[PDB]
Amino acid sequence: YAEMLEDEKNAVNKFIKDKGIRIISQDEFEKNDTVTNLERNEYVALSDGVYMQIVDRGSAENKTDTFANNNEICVRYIEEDIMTRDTTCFNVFLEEWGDANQLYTNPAVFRYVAEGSYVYGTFIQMDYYWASYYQSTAVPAGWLLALPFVRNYAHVRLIVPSKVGHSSAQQYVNPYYYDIWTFSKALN
Amino acid sequence: NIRMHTMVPDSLSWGKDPIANNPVRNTAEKQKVVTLGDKILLFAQNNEIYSTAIPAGSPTDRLNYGQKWDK
Amino acid sequence: INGIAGIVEINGEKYFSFAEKDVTWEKDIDKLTVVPAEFPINNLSADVYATESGTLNAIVVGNTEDGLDNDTATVVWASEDGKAWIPMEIPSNNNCPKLVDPSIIHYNDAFYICGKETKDDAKGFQKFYTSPTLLVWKGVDRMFMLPGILPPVKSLHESSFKGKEVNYTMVVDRNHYIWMVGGQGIDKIWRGRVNKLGFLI
Amino acid sequence: ETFGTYQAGFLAQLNCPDGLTFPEPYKEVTDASGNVISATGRMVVDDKDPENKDVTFIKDGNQIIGNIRAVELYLWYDSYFGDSLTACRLSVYELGGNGKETLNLDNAYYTDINPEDFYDSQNILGTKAYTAVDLSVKDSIRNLSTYVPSVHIAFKEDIATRVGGNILTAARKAKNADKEFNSQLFREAFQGIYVKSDYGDGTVLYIDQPQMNVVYKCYATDSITGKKLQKKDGSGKDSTYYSYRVFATTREVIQANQLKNDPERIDALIKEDKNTYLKSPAGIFTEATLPISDIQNELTGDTLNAVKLTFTNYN
């Protein structure tokens, strides 16, 4: 197969229809102030085919400390494979693996670059699981499309197609789902 | 020339015999030894002192001392 | 640093104090420090040496008070200056046994301790104990033995320390001779040096 | 001998992952005869048994919420500065108290914060003697590629009970209210640590990650019916093992340093006029004044192809 692998849209449509999920266009997302309603399970159709839901826009009392260029951002997440419905990557605590202290003790941290074009990001510290499993330092480009829409300590959920995935998703043409429990500005 | 040691380097050499007797009368008494200048002093509790003297210097030279003690 | 370090009993309580060159002890109770109950009391021995950083350091051992809880080892107390002494306590099994009238020296780039043991199955001076870094202690089962321990000329010398339980004293002179003086039961003077210190190399 | 004494120490907060909890207490269920039928939970909860004298049980109200076996700190480090056989001593204190300040985004990251107003001297947790190359560990172990050095400064039983009990009761208090035990709730139970140098001259350790383990006792339980397993050896009463939770400084929380140079010596060396210094740890920089005006006057109309500046040094 060469072009047949780009049928990932069928799997994403399967993953959408299997659950209660509604699609909102960005031109509606930016006009009902800015929120994806959680009682109705809204998702925005972002650029490059990313579907994204903000669960908590973050920093609700300060409202000012948004992300920007040259920041270093800490990420905690759990990654689900779309094609076979399996938890593939994580660095967060859950009771089913509570005693595996190596997996969740340290977060992933990346530098955020936002010059006039071509936003990109590089892991400074990879988590143990990512560092052993995927062994690459390039951040999934789908994550970086969400930063201009959220603040510090935000909680977001993303569906990422292969064109903007990581170094494995781009080769084996596999979309993924990320439950980003937290974006944080890096301290110390 | 094959140069070889005549005595083991990292070995504490005590000799075959103790080099001198203890000069203190009534050897039950408490003892103390200290060095000052070029002399080694041995003190005993009953206001009693003995002494011996050290040669000119250079620890690597062929020195011998300690066989005689003086009041 | 120039002066003498000692213990002074201000108003009935013991404090460490330091008499700097040609001036009296510090007696200001707000800025002395209290002597711990575990600190040695009698038959103290001490040594002073330069760390590889160029800073002097001092180390002491001796007899403790007559009875105290959970004590089973000869801990060595160090001090970077004269104001406050600090114990080199060892959590692991690498701690040297309890010794009576212990003596300590810094010698040929290592530390050594000697004393007499009281376990009733191997009483007396039994061996030296050594340390490369002051926090782990080993018994020397080979060269660098106690005086009078002869190699096979084919033995134990009558005036040897090994196995005896007597009064004694020792010093190191500026040619690096070890001097060991025995009381009742040994009655002799022993002298020795490791051969590596006399070589021209 | 040129710059005088240099001294350093650091303050650090410990992180707690979202939703982290200790295993639930082991609870029996019995039918009307008194015979046990099923059970849930994993942590040992019953005292008065001579087999459980190895741990201390902890409570709120009048109910036992768990047990503590030990609490222990590891300060991991990859490398160091200076000699590696000089003996040194280190001591650690708990942060916070009555009237003290706390670390925040404005207090931290200055290299000369005064720790005496972040901590109280009576809250000492422990002390350790160290040498930056630990000859107590066999060479065979120290050659392994998986070996990372550390100073291991585990606490005494009273301190372990206090700290572990506070952390465990905070975790239970969060769980029972259907909250989740995020780091801000952990910080109410254990603010952080201050690490201080008491004795030794020559070593500076590069502590990479301070880590704290809280250790507790658990039963082994049947995969189907949840009851305690009996020991597989002869005799025995029940089967138990020890498990732990980990709290560490992982860049989601604040850490700060005190890097104290000898101020008079630095101020004196700044006043030398035959030379300039570059003392790195918040010491001395050198400032240069470029002749931009002269270049702008003399080379107007030229294309500049290179402008070279060189600083050069003594041995």
Coordinates of C-alpha atoms in Angstrom, one line a residue, chain A residues 89-187:
Chain A
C89 CA 1.9 5.9 26.1
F90 CA 1.5 7.7 29.4
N91 CA 3.3 9.5 32.3
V92 CA 0.4 9.9 34.8
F93 CA -0.8 8.0 37.8
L94 CA -3.6 5.4 37.6
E95 CA -4.4 2.7 40.1
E96 CA -4.0 -0.1 37.5
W97 CA -0.3 0.7 37.4
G98 CA 0.1 2.5 40.7
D99 CA 3.2 0.6 41.9
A100 CA 5.2 1.1 38.7
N101 CA 7.0 4.1 40.1
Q102 CA 9.3 4.6 37.1
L103 CA 6.5 5.4 34.6
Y104 CA 4.8 8.5 36.2
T105 CA 7.4 10.1 38.5
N106 CA 8.9 12.6 35.9
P107 CA 7.1 14.6 33.3
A108 CA 7.9 15.5 29.7
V109 CA 9.3 19.0 29.1
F110 CA 9.8 20.8 25.8
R111 CA 11.0 24.1 24.4
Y112 CA 8.4 26.1 22.4
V113 CA 9.5 28.0 19.3
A114 CA 7.1 30.4 17.8
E115 CA 8.9 32.6 15.2
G116 CA 7.2 34.2 12.2
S117 CA 6.5 30.8 10.6
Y118 CA 6.9 27.1 11.2
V119 CA 6.0 26.6 14.9
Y120 CA 7.9 23.7 16.4
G121 CA 9.1 22.2 19.7
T122 CA 11.8 20.1 21.1
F123 CA 11.8 17.8 24.2
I124 CA 14.4 18.8 26.8
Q125 CA 13.4 16.0 29.1
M126 CA 11.5 13.0 27.9
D127 CA 9.6 10.8 30.3
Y128 CA 11.0 7.3 31.0
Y129 CA 8.3 5.6 28.9
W130 CA 8.6 7.9 25.8
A131 CA 12.4 7.8 26.2
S132 CA 12.5 4.0 26.1
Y133 CA 9.7 3.4 23.6
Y134 CA 9.9 6.1 20.9
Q135 CA 13.4 7.5 21.6
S136 CA 12.9 10.8 19.6
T137 CA 12.9 14.4 20.7
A138 CA 10.4 16.0 18.3
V139 CA 7.1 17.1 19.8
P140 CA 3.9 16.0 18.0
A141 CA 3.0 19.1 15.9
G142 CA -0.7 18.6 16.7
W143 CA 0.0 19.7 20.3
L144 CA 1.5 23.0 19.3
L145 CA -1.7 24.1 17.5
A146 CA -3.5 24.1 20.9
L147 CA -1.2 26.4 22.8
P148 CA -2.6 29.7 21.4
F149 CA -6.1 28.7 22.6
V150 CA -5.3 27.9 26.3
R151 CA -3.5 29.3 29.4
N152 CA -1.2 27.9 32.1
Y153 CA -2.3 24.7 33.8
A154 CA -4.8 23.8 31.0
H155 CA -6.5 20.5 30.4
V156 CA -7.2 19.6 26.8
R157 CA -8.1 16.5 24.7
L158 CA -6.8 16.0 21.2
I159 CA -7.2 13.7 18.2
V160 CA -4.0 14.0 16.0
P161 CA -3.8 12.7 12.5
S162 CA -0.7 11.2 11.0
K163 CA 0.5 14.3 9.1
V164 CA 1.2 16.1 12.4
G165 CA 2.1 13.1 14.6
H166 CA 5.4 12.0 16.1
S167 CA 8.2 10.1 14.3
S168 CA 6.3 6.8 14.6
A169 CA 2.8 8.1 13.6
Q170 CA 4.3 9.7 10.5
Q171 CA 5.8 6.5 9.2
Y172 CA 3.2 3.9 10.1
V173 CA 0.4 6.4 9.3
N174 CA -1.5 6.0 12.6
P175 CA -3.7 8.7 14.3
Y176 CA -3.7 9.0 18.1
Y177 CA -5.7 10.5 20.9
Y178 CA -4.1 12.5 23.8
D179 CA -5.7 13.3 27.1
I180 CA -3.4 16.1 28.2
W181 CA -4.0 16.3 31.9
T182 CA -1.8 19.4 32.2
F183 CA 0.3 22.0 30.3
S184 CA 2.5 24.0 32.7
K185 CA 5.1 26.6 32.4
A186 CA 8.3 25.0 33.7
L187 CA 9.4 25.9 37.2

